[PDB]
Amino acid sequence: MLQFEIDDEMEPLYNQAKQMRMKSTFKEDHSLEHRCVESAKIRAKYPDRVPVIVEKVSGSQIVDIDKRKYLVPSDITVAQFMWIIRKRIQLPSEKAIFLFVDKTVPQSSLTMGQLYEKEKDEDGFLYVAYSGENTFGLEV
Amino acid sequence: MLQFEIDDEMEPLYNQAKQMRMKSTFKEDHSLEHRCVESAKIRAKYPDRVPVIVEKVSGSQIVDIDKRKYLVPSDITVAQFMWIIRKRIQLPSEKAIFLFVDKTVPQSSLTMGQLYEKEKDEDGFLYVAYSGENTFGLEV
């Protein structure tokens, strides 16, 4: 328009862009149509597997995971899948880990099949975030 | 204007309003100026106490807490304060509890004084949310 201003909405995008040598998410990489087609294929081909996308909570200080797409046996429990993720990122047992579905911590005795049927995304994947504890950069 | 529509922004407010016999938050109850004055008074009068507001994560199925404002000794650790909250809501040890500061889980060996100096609100209080595990209404 006529006036202008340092757009506070854009400033985080500029700051994030300057730190590029891209950790884009599964949803940012693939259209909704493509994700829907893919999850339908997975469910047709592997009826007892739940397609899960695992991503670190944005900004968490825990190490990132090398693999984000998992075809998980439906009878695996939340606790068991948490152990699998812990093994994948090699987080020592003494350090806590947390899984989040819809920004809450799923009860650990639920199966991934239960959680999938109730909490799957519109695109047919179950999205699971993980983090550790936050030290806020303080002396622990 | 000229046109109209069932405002999706307002519909959750209508639905929430119909469930009234009000669980408003500390910030919703008190102006920013009043909160700033009060926390400054607390810090002047009790130099080794951190003023903490404890509130259940919105929508969590865990029981609500009867008391939200705490003047916590600064050398109390996060783990110890979690135990205090657990006692206050009488949550059995077998059920998990989580504390959140700025939407993350604070490291359990930090003191409330450390967490206060780093993560206090602009209004001078430390805001701590708590929840349990989410069963998503499923059979546990």
Residue numbers in the entry:
A (entry chain A), B (entry chain A): 1 to 21, 26 to 144
What text appears in the publication on this structure?
An atypical LIR motif from SpHfl1 (LIR[Sp]), which binds to Atg8 in yeast, was mostly localized to GABARAPL2- and weakly but significantly localized to GABARAP- and GABARAPL1-containing autophagic membranes. Isothermal titration calorimetry (ITC) experiments further confirmed the strong and specific binding affinity of LIR(Sp) to GABARAPL2; the dissociation constant (Kd) of LIR(Sp) to GABARAPL2 was 0.24 μM, which was 8–12 times lower than that to GABARAP (1.8 μM) and GABARAPL1 (2.9 μM). We successfully determined the structure of the LIR(Sp)-GABARAPL2 fusion protein at a resolution of 1.86 Å. The structure of the LIR(Sp)-GABARAPL2 complex is similar to that of the LIR(Sp)-SpAtg8 complex. The SpHfl1 LIR consists of an α-helix, from D391 to M404, and an N-terminal tail. The helix formed extensive hydrophobic interactions with V51, P52, I55, W62, and I63 of GABARAPL2 using M394, L397, Y398, A401, and M404. Among these, Y398 formed the most critical interaction, as it was inserted deep into the L-site pocket of GABARAPL2. In addition to hydrophobic interactions, three acidic residues of LIR(Sp), D391, E393, and E395, formed electrostatic interactions with K46, R67, and R28 in GABARAPL2, respectively. Although most of the interactions were similar to those in the LIR(Sp)-SpATG8 structure, F388 of SpHfl1 was not inserted into the W-site of GABARAPL2. Among the GABARAPL2 residues involved in the interaction with LIR(Sp), W62 was the sole residue that was not conserved in other mATG8 proteins (F, K, or S was also observed at this position).
